[PDB]
Amino acid sequence: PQVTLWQRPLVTIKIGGQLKEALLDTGADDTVLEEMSLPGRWKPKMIGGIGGFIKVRQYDQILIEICGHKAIGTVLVGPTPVNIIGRDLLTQIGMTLNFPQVTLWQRPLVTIKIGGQLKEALLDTGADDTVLEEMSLPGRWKPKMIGGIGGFIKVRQYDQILIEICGHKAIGTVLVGPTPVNIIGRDLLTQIGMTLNF
């Protein structure tokens, strides 16, 4: 299947004998699920994201069926607001990002130019919105809060900002704040014709 990004790329998964919906998230290194019952031993673990860190239980060698496809790997379980399938499992089902084609064995980074400056950013299908680390942008903005793995952060919303991502230009809203990494969300991914293919 090919998947465009005008809506969140959700899929049905079967794990631990249970059915769940999860977000195909190219911006996630690891797969993280909301609290659920899984068989066996686990290890305590802390993972970070927008908003900070959360404690999760790490289960190893867990069978997961994602769409029609099987994979076995590590699964983290904890207080994430959304079930996310990260690159660890995307690679196993042969997922690629197309806009150039990109496999997901490494973080899908691209060079962007915004506000006259050059930055590197993560192509993040799991992000509704584009969020950049603190930077100098031209003009007026509005105070805003956005949520994520470890809670919420306050960001400045700038409207009508030109961004050039890889080759391609796009205009839209950009959030600026204490995100750990620059993220290109679906708002801009759709403008450069990005798709998920598996």
Coordinates of N, CA, C and O in Angstrom, one line a residue:
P1 N 0.8 -1.2 0.0 CA 0.0 0.0 0.0 C 0.8 1.3 0.0 O 1.9 1.3 0.6
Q2 N 0.3 2.3 -0.7 CA 0.9 3.6 -0.6 C 0.0 4.4 0.3 O -1.2 4.2 0.3
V3 N 0.6 5.4 1.1 CA -0.2 6.2 2.0 C 0.2 7.6 1.8 O 1.4 7.9 2.0
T4 N -0.7 8.5 1.6 CA -0.4 9.9 1.6 C -0.6 10.4 3.0 O -1.0 9.7 3.9
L5 N -0.3 11.7 3.2 CA -0.2 12.2 4.6 C -1.1 13.3 5.0 O -0.9 14.1 5.9
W6 N -2.2 13.5 4.2 CA -3.2 14.5 4.5 C -4.0 14.1 5.8 O -4.6 15.0 6.4
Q7 N -3.9 12.9 6.2 CA -4.4 12.4 7.5 C -3.4 11.6 8.2 O -2.4 11.2 7.6
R8 N -3.5 11.5 9.5 CA -2.5 10.6 10.2 C -2.5 9.2 9.7 O -3.5 8.6 9.4
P9 N -1.3 8.7 9.4 CA -1.1 7.3 8.9 C -1.3 6.3 9.9 O -0.4 5.8 10.5
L10 N -2.6 5.9 10.2 CA -2.9 4.9 11.2 C -3.0 3.5 10.5 O -3.4 3.4 9.4
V11 N -2.7 2.5 11.3 CA -2.8 1.1 10.9 C -3.3 0.3 12.0 O -3.2 0.6 13.2
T12 N -3.9 -0.9 11.7 CA -4.3 -1.8 12.7 C -3.2 -2.8 13.0 O -2.6 -3.3 12.0
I13 N -3.0 -3.1 14.2 CA -1.9 -4.0 14.6 C -2.5 -5.1 15.5 O -3.5 -4.8 16.2
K14 N -1.9 -6.2 15.5 CA -2.2 -7.3 16.5 C -1.0 -7.6 17.3 O 0.0 -8.0 16.7
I15 N -1.1 -7.4 18.6 CA 0.0 -7.7 19.5 C -0.5 -8.2 20.8 O -1.5 -7.7 21.3
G16 N 0.2 -9.2 21.3 CA -0.3 -9.8 22.6 C -1.7 -10.4 22.5 O -2.4 -10.4 23.6
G17 N -2.1 -10.8 21.4 CA -3.5 -11.3 21.2 C -4.6 -10.3 21.1 O -5.8 -10.6 21.1
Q18 N -4.2 -9.0 21.1 CA -5.1 -7.9 21.1 C -5.0 -7.0 19.8 O -4.0 -7.0 19.2
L19 N -6.1 -6.4 19.5 CA -6.1 -5.5 18.3 C -6.0 -4.0 18.7 O -6.7 -3.6 19.7
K20 N -5.2 -3.3 18.1 CA -5.0 -1.9 18.4 C -4.7 -1.1 17.2 O -4.3 -1.6 16.1
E21 N -4.9 0.2 17.2 CA -4.6 1.2 16.2 C -3.3 1.9 16.5 O -3.1 2.3 17.7
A22 N -2.4 2.1 15.6 CA -1.2 2.7 15.8 C -0.8 3.6 14.7 O -1.2 3.5 13.5
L23 N 0.1 4.6 15.0 CA 0.5 5.6 14.1 C 1.9 5.2 13.5 O 2.9 5.0 14.2
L24 N 2.0 5.1 12.2 CA 3.2 4.9 11.5 C 4.1 6.2 11.6 O 3.7 7.2 11.1
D25 N 5.2 6.1 12.3 CA 5.8 7.3 12.8 C 7.3 7.3 12.4 O 8.2 6.7 13.1
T26 N 7.7 7.9 11.3 CA 9.0 7.9 10.8 C 10.0 8.7 11.7 O 11.2 8.6 11.7
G27 N 9.4 9.5 12.6 CA 10.1 10.3 13.5 C 10.4 9.6 14.8 O 11.1 10.2 15.7
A28 N 10.0 8.4 15.0 CA 10.2 7.6 16.2 C 11.2 6.5 15.9 O 11.1 5.7 15.0
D29 N 12.3 6.5 16.8 CA 13.3 5.4 16.7 C 12.7 4.1 17.1 O 12.9 3.1 16.5
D30 N 11.8 4.2 18.1 CA 11.3 3.0 18.8 C 9.8 2.9 18.8 O 9.1 3.9 18.7
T31 N 9.2 1.7 18.9 CA 7.8 1.5 18.9 C 7.3 1.6 20.4 O 7.9 1.0 21.3
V32 N 6.3 2.4 20.6 CA 5.8 2.7 22.0 C 4.3 2.6 22.0 O 3.6 3.3 21.2
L33 N 3.8 1.8 22.9 CA 2.3 1.6 23.0 C 1.8 2.0 24.3 O 2.5 2.0 25.3
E34 N 0.6 2.5 24.3 CA -0.1 2.8 25.5 C -0.2 1.6 26.4 O 0.0 0.5 26.0
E35 N -0.4 1.8 27.7 CA -0.5 0.7 28.7 C -1.3 -0.4 28.2 O -2.4 -0.3 27.7
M36 N -0.8 -1.7 28.3 CA -1.5 -2.9 27.9 C -0.8 -4.1 28.5 O 0.3 -4.0 29.0
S37 N -1.6 -5.2 28.5 CA -1.1 -6.4 29.0 C -0.3 -7.2 28.0 O -0.8 -7.5 26.9
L38 N 1.0 -7.5 28.3 CA 1.8 -8.3 27.5 C 2.5 -9.4 28.3 O 2.7 -9.3 29.5
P39 N 2.8 -10.6 27.6 CA 3.3 -11.7 28.3 C 4.8 -11.5 28.7 O 5.6 -11.0 27.8
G40 N 5.2 -11.8 29.9 CA 6.6 -12.0 30.2 C 7.3 -11.0 31.0 O 6.8 -10.0 31.5
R41 N 8.6 -11.1 30.9 CA 9.6 -10.3 31.7 C 9.8 -9.0 30.9 O 9.7 -8.9 29.7
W42 N 10.1 -7.9 31.7 CA 10.4 -6.6 31.1 C 11.5 -5.9 31.9 O 11.9 -6.3 33.0
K43 N 12.0 -4.8 31.3 CA 13.0 -4.0 31.9 C 12.5 -2.5 32.0 O 12.0 -2.0 31.0
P44 N 12.7 -1.9 33.1 CA 12.3 -0.4 33.2 C 13.2 0.4 32.3 O 14.4 0.1 32.1
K45 N 12.7 1.4 31.6 CA 13.4 2.2 30.7 C 12.8 3.6 30.6 O 11.6 3.8 30.8
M46 N 13.7 4.6 30.4 CA 13.2 6.0 30.2 C 13.4 6.4 28.7 O 14.5 6.2 28.2
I47 N 12.4 7.0 28.1 CA 12.6 7.5 26.7 C 12.1 8.9 26.7 O 11.3 9.4 27.4
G48 N 12.7 9.7 25.8 CA 12.5 11.1 25.7 C 11.7 11.5 24.5 O 11.6 10.8 23.5
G49 N 11.2 12.7 24.5 CA 10.4 13.3 23.4 C 10.1 14.7 23.6 O 10.6 15.3 24.5
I50 N 9.2 15.3 22.8 CA 8.6 16.6 23.0 C 7.9 16.5 24.4 O 7.1 15.6 24.6
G51 N 8.2 17.5 25.3 CA 7.5 17.5 26.6 C 8.4 16.9 27.7 O 8.1 17.1 28.8
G52 N 9.4 16.1 27.3 CA 10.3 15.5 28.2 C 10.3 14.0 28.1 O 10.1 13.4 27.0
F53 N 10.5 13.3 29.3 CA 10.7 11.9 29.3 C 9.6 11.1 30.0 O 8.9 11.7 30.8
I54 N 9.4 9.9 29.6 CA 8.5 9.0 30.3 C 9.2 7.7 30.7 O 10.1 7.3 30.0
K55 N 8.7 7.0 31.7 CA 9.2 5.7 32.0 C 8.3 4.7 31.4 O 7.1 4.8 31.4
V56 N 9.0 3.7 30.7 CA 8.3 2.7 30.0 C 8.8 1.3 30.4 O 9.9 1.2 31.0
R57 N 8.0 0.3 30.2 CA 8.5 -1.1 30.4 C 8.9 -1.6 29.0 O 8.2 -1.5 28.0
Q58 N 10.1 -2.1 28.9 CA 10.6 -2.7 27.7 C 10.4 -4.2 27.6 O 11.0 -4.9 28.5
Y59 N 9.7 -4.6 26.6 CA 9.5 -6.0 26.3 C 10.3 -6.4 25.1 O 10.2 -5.7 24.1
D60 N 11.0 -7.5 25.1 CA 11.8 -7.9 24.0 C 11.2 -9.1 23.3 O 10.3 -9.8 23.9
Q61 N 11.5 -9.3 22.0 CA 11.0 -10.5 21.3 C 9.5 -10.6 21.2 O 9.0 -11.7 21.4
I62 N 8.8 -9.5 21.1 CA 7.4 -9.5 21.0 C 6.9 -9.5 19.5 O 7.4 -8.8 18.7
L63 N 6.0 -10.5 19.3 CA 5.4 -10.6 17.9 C 4.4 -9.5 17.7 O 3.5 -9.3 18.4
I64 N 4.6 -8.8 16.5 CA 3.6 -7.8 16.1 C 3.2 -8.0 14.7 O 4.0 -8.2 13.8
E65 N 1.9 -7.9 14.4 CA 1.4 -7.9 13.1 C 0.8 -6.6 12.7 O -0.1 -6.1 13.3
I66 N 1.5 -5.9 11.8 CA 1.2 -4.5 11.4 C 0.7 -4.5 10.0 O 1.4 -4.7 9.0
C67 N -0.6 -4.1 9.8 CA -1.3 -4.4 8.6 C -1.2 -5.9 8.4 O -1.4 -6.7 9.3
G68 N -0.9 -6.3 7.1 CA -0.8 -7.7 6.9 C 0.5 -8.4 7.2 O 0.7 -9.6 7.0
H69 N 1.4 -7.7 7.8 CA 2.8 -8.1 7.9 C 3.3 -8.4 9.4 O 2.9 -7.7 10.3
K70 N 4.1 -9.4 9.5 CA 4.6 -9.8 10.8 C 6.0 -9.2 11.1 O 6.8 -9.1 10.2
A71 N 6.3 -9.0 12.3 CA 7.6 -8.5 12.8 C 7.8 -8.9 14.2 O 6.8 -9.1 15.0
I72 N 9.1 -9.1 14.6 CA 9.4 -9.4 16.0 C 10.4 -8.4 16.4 O 11.4 -8.2 15.7
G73 N 10.2 -7.8 17.6 CA 11.2 -6.8 18.1 C 10.9 -6.4 19.5 O 10.0 -7.0 20.1
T74 N 11.5 -5.3 19.9 CA 11.3 -4.8 21.2 C 10.1 -3.8 21.1 O 10.0 -3.0 20.2
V75 N 9.3 -3.8 22.2 CA 8.2 -2.9 22.3 C 8.2 -2.3 23.6 O 8.3 -2.9 24.7
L76 N 8.0 -0.9 23.6 CA 8.0 -0.2 24.9 C 6.5 0.1 25.2 O 5.7 0.4 24.3
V77 N 6.2 0.0 26.5 CA 4.8 0.2 26.9 C 4.8 1.2 28.0 O 5.5 1.1 29.0
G78 N 3.9 2.2 27.9 CA 3.9 3.3 28.9 C 3.0 4.4 28.6 O 2.1 4.3 27.6
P79 N 3.1 5.5 29.3 CA 2.2 6.7 29.2 C 2.5 7.6 27.9 O 2.7 8.8 28.1
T80 N 2.5 6.9 26.8 CA 2.5 7.7 25.5 C 1.0 8.0 25.2 O 0.1 7.2 25.4
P81 N 0.8 9.2 24.6 CA -0.6 9.6 24.3 C -1.2 8.9 23.1 O -2.4 8.8 22.9
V82 N -0.3 8.3 22.3 CA -0.7 7.6 21.1 C 0.2 6.4 20.9 O 1.4 6.4 21.1
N83 N -0.4 5.3 20.4 CA 0.4 4.1 20.0 C 1.2 4.5 18.8 O 0.7 4.9 17.7
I84 N 2.5 4.3 18.8 CA 3.4 4.6 17.7 C 4.3 3.5 17.3 O 4.9 2.8 18.0
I85 N 4.3 3.3 15.9 CA 5.2 2.3 15.3 C 6.4 3.1 14.8 O 6.3 3.9 13.9
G86 N 7.6 2.7 15.4 CA 8.8 3.5 15.0 C 9.6 2.7 14.0 O 9.2 1.7 13.5
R87 N 10.8 3.3 13.7 CA 11.5 2.8 12.5 C 12.0 1.4 12.8 O 12.2 0.6 11.8
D88 N 12.2 1.0 14.0 CA 12.6 -0.4 14.4 C 11.7 -1.4 13.7 O 12.1 -2.5 13.4
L89 N 10.4 -1.1 13.6 CA 9.4 -2.1 13.0 C 9.1 -1.6 11.6 O 8.7 -2.5 10.8
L90 N 9.1 -0.4 11.3 CA 8.9 0.1 9.9 C 9.8 -0.6 8.9 O 9.4 -1.0 7.8
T91 N 11.1 -0.7 9.3 CA 12.1 -1.3 8.5 C 11.8 -2.8 8.2 O 12.1 -3.3 7.1
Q92 N 11.2 -3.5 9.1 CA 10.9 -4.9 9.0 C 9.7 -5.1 8.0 O 9.6 -6.2 7.4
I93 N 8.8 -4.1 7.8 CA 7.7 -4.3 6.9 C 8.0 -3.6 5.6 O 7.1 -3.4 4.8
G94 N 9.3 -3.2 5.4 CA 9.7 -2.6 4.1 C 9.1 -1.2 3.8 O 8.9 -0.9 2.7
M95 N 8.9 -0.4 4.9 CA 8.4 0.9 4.7 C 9.4 1.8 4.1 O 10.5 1.9 4.6
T96 N 9.0 2.6 3.1 CA 9.9 3.7 2.6 C 9.1 5.0 2.6 O 7.9 5.1 2.5
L97 N 9.9 6.1 2.6 CA 9.3 7.5 2.5 C 9.7 8.0 1.0 O 10.8 7.9 0.6
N98 N 8.7 8.4 0.3 CA 8.9 8.9 -1.1 C 8.4 10.3 -1.3 O 7.3 10.7 -1.0
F99 N 9.3 11.2 -1.9 CA 8.9 12.5 -2.2 C 9.7 13.2 -3.3 O 10.4 12.5 -4.1
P100 N 13.1 11.6 -4.5 CA 13.9 10.8 -3.7 C 13.1 9.7 -2.9 O 12.1 10.0 -2.4
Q101 N 13.7 8.5 -2.8 CA 13.1 7.5 -2.0 C 14.0 7.3 -0.8 O 15.2 7.4 -0.9
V102 N 13.4 7.0 0.4 CA 14.2 6.9 1.6 C 13.7 5.7 2.4 O 12.6 5.5 2.7
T103 N 14.7 4.8 2.7 CA 14.4 3.7 3.6 C 14.6 4.2 5.0 O 15.0 5.4 5.2
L104 N 14.3 3.4 6.0 CA 14.1 3.9 7.4 C 15.1 3.3 8.4 O 14.9 3.3 9.6
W105 N 16.2 2.7 7.9 CA 17.2 2.1 8.7 C 17.9 3.2 9.6 O 18.6 2.9 10.6
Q106 N 17.9 4.4 9.1 CA 18.4 5.6 9.8 C 17.3 6.6 9.9 O 16.3 6.6 9.2
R107 N 17.5 7.6 10.8 CA 16.6 8.7 10.8 C 16.5 9.4 9.5 O 17.6 9.7 8.9
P108 N 15.3 9.7 9.0 CA 15.1 10.4 7.7 C 15.3 11.9 7.9 O 14.4 12.7 8.1
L109 N 16.6 12.3 7.8 CA 16.9 13.8 8.0 C 17.0 14.5 6.6 O 17.4 13.8 5.6
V110 N 16.6 15.7 6.6 CA 16.8 16.5 5.4 C 17.3 17.9 5.8 O 17.2 18.3 6.9
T111 N 17.9 18.6 4.8 CA 18.3 20.0 5.0 C 17.2 20.9 4.6 O 16.6 20.7 3.6
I112 N 17.0 21.9 5.5 CA 15.9 22.9 5.2 C 16.5 24.3 5.2 O 17.6 24.5 5.9
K113 N 15.9 25.2 4.5 CA 16.3 26.6 4.6 C 15.0 27.3 5.1 O 14.0 27.2 4.4
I114 N 15.1 28.0 6.2 CA 14.0 28.8 6.7 C 14.5 30.0 7.4 O 15.6 30.0 8.0
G115 N 13.8 31.1 7.2 CA 14.2 32.4 7.8 C 15.7 32.8 7.4 O 16.4 33.3 8.3
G116 N 16.1 32.5 6.2 CA 17.5 32.7 5.8 C 18.6 31.9 6.4 O 19.7 32.1 6.2
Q117 N 18.2 30.8 7.1 CA 19.1 30.0 7.8 C 19.0 28.5 7.4 O 18.0 28.1 6.9
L118 N 20.1 27.8 7.6 CA 20.1 26.4 7.2 C 20.0 25.5 8.5 O 20.7 25.7 9.4
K119 N 19.2 24.5 8.4 CA 19.0 23.5 9.5 C 18.8 22.1 9.0 O 18.4 21.9 7.8
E120 N 18.9 21.2 9.9 CA 18.6 19.8 9.6 C 17.4 19.4 10.3 O 17.2 19.9 11.4
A121 N 16.5 18.7 9.7 CA 15.2 18.3 10.3 C 14.8 16.9 10.0 O 15.2 16.3 9.0
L122 N 14.0 16.4 10.9 CA 13.5 15.0 10.8 C 12.2 15.0 10.0 O 11.2 15.6 10.5
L123 N 12.1 14.2 8.9 CA 10.8 13.9 8.3 C 10.0 13.0 9.2 O 10.3 11.9 9.4
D124 N 8.9 13.6 9.7 CA 8.2 12.9 10.8 C 6.7 12.7 10.5 O 5.9 13.6 10.7
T125 N 6.4 11.5 10.0 CA 5.0 11.2 9.7 C 4.1 11.2 10.9 O 2.9 11.2 10.8
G126 N 4.7 11.1 12.1 CA 3.9 11.0 13.3 C 3.6 12.4 13.9 O 2.9 12.5 14.9
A127 N 4.0 13.4 13.2 CA 3.8 14.8 13.7 C 2.8 15.5 12.8 O 2.9 15.6 11.6
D128 N 1.7 16.1 13.5 CA 0.7 16.8 12.8 C 1.4 18.1 12.2 O 1.1 18.5 11.1
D129 N 2.2 18.7 13.1 CA 2.8 20.0 12.9 C 4.3 20.0 12.8 O 5.0 19.2 13.4
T130 N 4.8 21.1 12.1 CA 6.3 21.3 12.0 C 6.7 22.1 13.2 O 6.1 23.1 13.6
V131 N 7.7 21.6 13.9 CA 8.2 22.2 15.2 C 9.8 22.3 15.1 O 10.4 21.3 14.9
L132 N 10.3 23.5 15.3 CA 11.7 23.7 15.2 C 12.3 24.2 16.6 O 11.6 24.8 17.3
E133 N 13.5 23.8 16.8 CA 14.2 24.3 18.0 C 14.3 25.8 18.0 O 14.1 26.4 16.9
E134 N 14.5 26.4 19.1 CA 14.6 27.9 19.2 C 15.5 28.5 18.1 O 16.6 28.0 17.8
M135 N 14.9 29.5 17.4 CA 15.6 30.2 16.3 C 14.9 31.5 16.1 O 13.8 31.8 16.4
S136 N 15.7 32.4 15.4 CA 15.2 33.7 15.0 C 14.4 33.7 13.7 O 14.9 33.4 12.7
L137 N 13.1 34.1 13.8 CA 12.3 34.2 12.7 C 11.7 35.6 12.5 O 11.6 36.3 13.5
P138 N 11.3 35.9 11.3 CA 10.8 37.3 11.0 C 9.4 37.4 11.4 O 8.6 36.6 11.1
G139 N 9.1 38.5 12.1 CA 7.7 38.9 12.3 C 7.0 38.5 13.6 O 7.6 38.1 14.6
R140 N 5.7 38.4 13.4 CA 4.8 38.2 14.6 C 4.4 36.8 14.8 O 4.3 36.0 13.9
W141 N 4.0 36.5 16.1 CA 3.7 35.1 16.4 C 2.6 35.1 17.6 O 2.2 36.1 18.1
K142 N 2.2 33.9 17.9 CA 1.2 33.7 18.9 C 1.6 32.5 19.8 O 2.1 31.5 19.4
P143 N 1.4 32.7 21.1 CA 1.8 31.7 22.1 C 0.9 30.5 22.0 O -0.3 30.6 21.7
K144 N 1.5 29.3 22.1 CA 0.8 28.1 21.8 C 1.4 26.9 22.6 O 2.6 26.9 22.8
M145 N 0.5 26.0 22.9 CA 1.0 24.7 23.6 C 0.7 23.5 22.7 O -0.4 23.4 22.2
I146 N 1.7 22.6 22.6 CA 1.5 21.4 21.9 C 2.0 20.2 22.8 O 2.9 20.3 23.6
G147 N 1.3 19.1 22.6 CA 1.6 17.9 23.4 C 2.5 16.9 22.7 O 2.6 16.9 21.4
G148 N 3.0 15.9 23.4 CA 3.9 14.9 22.9 C 4.2 13.8 23.9 O 3.6 13.8 25.0
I149 N 5.2 13.0 23.6 CA 5.5 11.8 24.4 C 5.6 12.1 25.9 O 5.0 11.4 26.7
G150 N 6.3 13.2 26.3 CA 6.6 13.4 27.7 C 5.8 14.5 28.3 O 6.0 14.9 29.5
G151 N 4.8 15.0 27.6 CA 3.9 16.1 28.1 C 3.8 17.2 27.0 O 3.9 17.0 25.8
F152 N 3.6 18.4 27.5 CA 3.4 19.6 26.6 C 4.5 20.6 26.7 O 5.2 20.6 27.7
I153 N 4.7 21.3 25.7 CA 5.6 22.4 25.7 C 5.0 23.7 25.1 O 4.0 23.6 24.4
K154 N 5.5 24.8 25.6 CA 5.0 26.1 25.0 C 5.9 26.5 23.8 O 7.1 26.3 23.8
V155 N 5.2 26.9 22.7 CA 5.9 27.2 21.5 C 5.4 28.5 20.9 O 4.3 29.0 21.3
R156 N 6.1 29.2 20.0 CA 5.7 30.3 19.4 C 5.2 29.9 18.0 O 5.9 29.2 17.3
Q157 N 4.0 30.3 17.6 CA 3.4 30.0 16.3 C 3.7 31.1 15.4 O 3.2 32.2 15.6
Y158 N 4.5 30.9 14.3 CA 4.7 31.8 13.2 C 3.9 31.4 12.0 O 4.0 30.2 11.6
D159 N 3.2 32.3 11.4 CA 2.3 32.0 10.2 C 3.0 32.4 8.9 O 3.8 33.3 9.0
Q160 N 2.6 31.7 7.8 CA 3.1 32.1 6.5 C 4.6 32.2 6.4 O 5.2 33.2 5.9
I161 N 5.3 31.2 6.9 CA 6.7 31.1 6.9 C 7.1 30.2 5.7 O 6.7 29.1 5.5
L162 N 8.0 30.8 4.8 CA 8.6 30.0 3.7 C 9.6 29.0 4.2 O 10.5 29.4 4.9
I163 N 9.4 27.8 3.8 CA 10.5 26.7 4.0 C 10.8 26.0 2.8 O 10.0 25.7 1.9
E164 N 12.1 25.8 2.6 CA 12.6 25.0 1.5 C 13.2 23.8 2.0 O 14.1 23.8 2.8
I165 N 12.6 22.6 1.7 CA 12.9 21.3 2.3 C 13.4 20.4 1.2 O 12.7 20.0 0.3
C166 N 14.6 19.9 1.4 CA 15.3 19.3 0.3 C 15.2 20.3 -0.8 O 15.4 21.5 -0.6
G167 N 14.9 19.9 -2.1 CA 14.7 20.8 -3.1 C 13.6 21.8 -3.0 O 13.7 23.0 -3.4
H168 N 12.5 21.4 -2.4 CA 11.2 22.0 -2.6 C 10.7 23.1 -1.6 O 10.9 22.9 -0.4
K169 N 10.0 24.1 -2.2 CA 9.5 25.2 -1.4 C 8.1 24.8 -0.8 O 7.4 24.1 -1.4
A170 N 7.8 25.5 0.3 CA 6.4 25.3 0.9 C 6.2 26.5 1.8 O 7.2 27.1 2.3
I171 N 4.9 26.8 2.0 CA 4.6 27.9 3.0 C 3.6 27.4 3.9 O 2.6 26.7 3.6
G172 N 3.8 27.7 5.2 CA 2.8 27.3 6.2 C 3.2 27.8 7.6 O 4.1 28.6 7.8
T173 N 2.5 27.2 8.6 CA 2.8 27.6 10.0 C 3.9 26.8 10.5 O 4.1 25.6 10.2
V174 N 4.8 27.5 11.3 CA 5.9 26.8 11.9 C 5.9 27.1 13.4 O 5.7 28.3 13.8
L175 N 6.0 26.1 14.2 CA 6.1 26.3 15.7 C 7.6 26.3 16.1 O 8.4 25.5 15.5
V176 N 7.9 27.1 17.0 CA 9.3 27.2 17.5 C 9.3 27.1 19.0 O 8.5 27.8 19.7
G177 N 10.1 26.2 19.5 CA 10.2 26.0 21.0 C 11.1 24.9 21.4 O 12.0 24.4 20.6
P178 N 11.0 24.5 22.7 CA 12.0 23.5 23.3 C 11.7 22.1 22.8 O 11.7 21.2 23.6
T179 N 11.6 21.9 21.5 CA 11.6 20.5 21.0 C 13.1 20.0 20.9 O 14.0 20.8 20.7
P180 N 13.3 18.7 21.2 CA 14.6 18.1 21.3 C 15.2 18.1 19.9 O 16.5 18.1 19.8
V181 N 14.4 18.0 18.8 CA 14.9 17.9 17.5 C 13.9 18.7 16.5 O 12.7 18.7 16.8
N182 N 14.5 19.2 15.5 CA 13.6 19.9 14.4 C 12.8 18.8 13.7 O 13.4 17.8 13.2
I183 N 11.5 19.0 13.6 CA 10.6 18.1 13.1 C 9.8 18.6 11.9 O 9.1 19.7 12.1
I184 N 9.7 18.0 10.8 CA 8.9 18.4 9.7 C 7.6 17.5 9.8 O 7.7 16.3 9.6
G185 N 6.5 18.1 10.0 CA 5.2 17.3 10.2 C 4.4 17.2 9.0 O 4.8 17.7 7.9
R186 N 3.2 16.6 9.1 CA 2.4 16.3 7.9 C 2.0 17.6 7.2 O 1.8 17.5 6.0
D187 N 1.9 18.6 7.9 CA 1.5 19.9 7.3 C 2.4 20.3 6.2 O 1.9 20.9 5.2
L188 N 3.7 20.0 6.3 CA 4.6 20.4 5.2 C 4.9 19.1 4.4 O 5.2 19.3 3.2
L189 N 4.8 17.9 4.9 CA 5.1 16.7 4.2 C 4.2 16.6 3.0 O 4.5 16.2 1.9
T190 N 2.9 17.0 3.2 CA 1.9 17.0 2.1 C 2.2 17.9 1.0 O 1.9 17.6 -0.2
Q191 N 2.9 19.0 1.3 CA 3.2 20.0 0.3 C 4.3 19.6 -0.7 O 4.4 20.0 -1.8
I192 N 5.2 18.7 -0.2 CA 6.3 18.2 -1.0 C 6.0 16.8 -1.6 O 6.9 16.2 -2.1
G193 N 4.7 16.4 -1.5 CA 4.3 15.1 -2.1 C 4.9 13.9 -1.4 O 5.1 12.9 -2.1
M194 N 5.1 13.9 -0.1 CA 5.6 12.8 0.6 C 4.6 11.7 0.7 O 3.4 12.0 1.0
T195 N 5.0 10.4 0.6 CA 4.1 9.3 0.8 C 4.9 8.2 1.5 O 6.1 8.1 1.5
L196 N 4.1 7.4 2.2 CA 4.7 6.2 2.9 C 4.3 5.0 2.1 O 3.2 4.8 1.7
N197 N 5.3 4.1 1.8 CA 5.1 3.0 0.9 C 5.5 1.7 1.6 O 6.7 1.5 2.0
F198 N 4.6 0.7 1.7 CA 5.0 -0.6 2.2 C 4.2 -1.8 1.6 O 4.4 -3.0 2.0

